[PDB]
């Protein structure tokens, strides 16, 4: 489901980035949301996934999340994630 597309796509980067760079991602995407630093522990799966949904939406947020994450820490690694979006397209056409 869509939950798997957002959770996996996110943790893929959080588990590959450092704590120092992590502060940049949160500060870039979430400016007025000020995501809790303590939640960062499980933020990859639970917090970041559900959080962004409230800002713009499930698919909408994860979509732009790529452009931000790539241009900020690993524009090279993110390239692999954006490819998954293709298969995700048909995943949104089902219940």
CATH number (domain holding residue 85): 1.10.533.10
- Domain hosting 41: range is 1-95
Long-range contacts of 86-93 (CB under 8 A, 24+ apart): 88/2, 88/5, 88/59, 91/1, 91/2, 91/5, 92/2, 92/59
Query: Whole-angstrom Cα distance, residue 85 to residue 62?
Result: 9
> 92: exposed, middle or buried (C-beta count within 10 Å: 0-12, 13-18, 19+)?
exposed
Query: Whole-angstrom Cα distance, residue 20 to residue 5?
Result: 26
Contact between residue 12 and residue 85 where contact means Cβ atoms under 8 Å apart: no
Count of domains for the chain: 1
Query: Whole-angstrom Cα distance, residue 73 to residue 46?
Result: 21
* Cβ contacts of 23 within 8 Å, gap of 6 or more: none
Closest CA to 80 of 13, 4, 3: 13
């Amino acid at each position: 489901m869509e939950s798997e597309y957002r959770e996996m796509l996110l943790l893929t980067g959080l588990d590959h980035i450092t704590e120092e760079e992590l502060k940049r991602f949160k500060y870039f995407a979430l400016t007025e949301f000020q995501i809790a630093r303590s939640t960062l522990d499980v933020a990859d799966r639970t917090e970041l996934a559900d959080h962004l949904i409230q800002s713009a939406g499930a698919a909408s947020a994860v979509t732009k999340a790529i452009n931000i994450f790539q241009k900020l820490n690993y524009m090279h690694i993110a390239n692999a994630l954006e490819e998954k979006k293709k298969e995700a397209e048909r995943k949104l056409m089902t219940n």
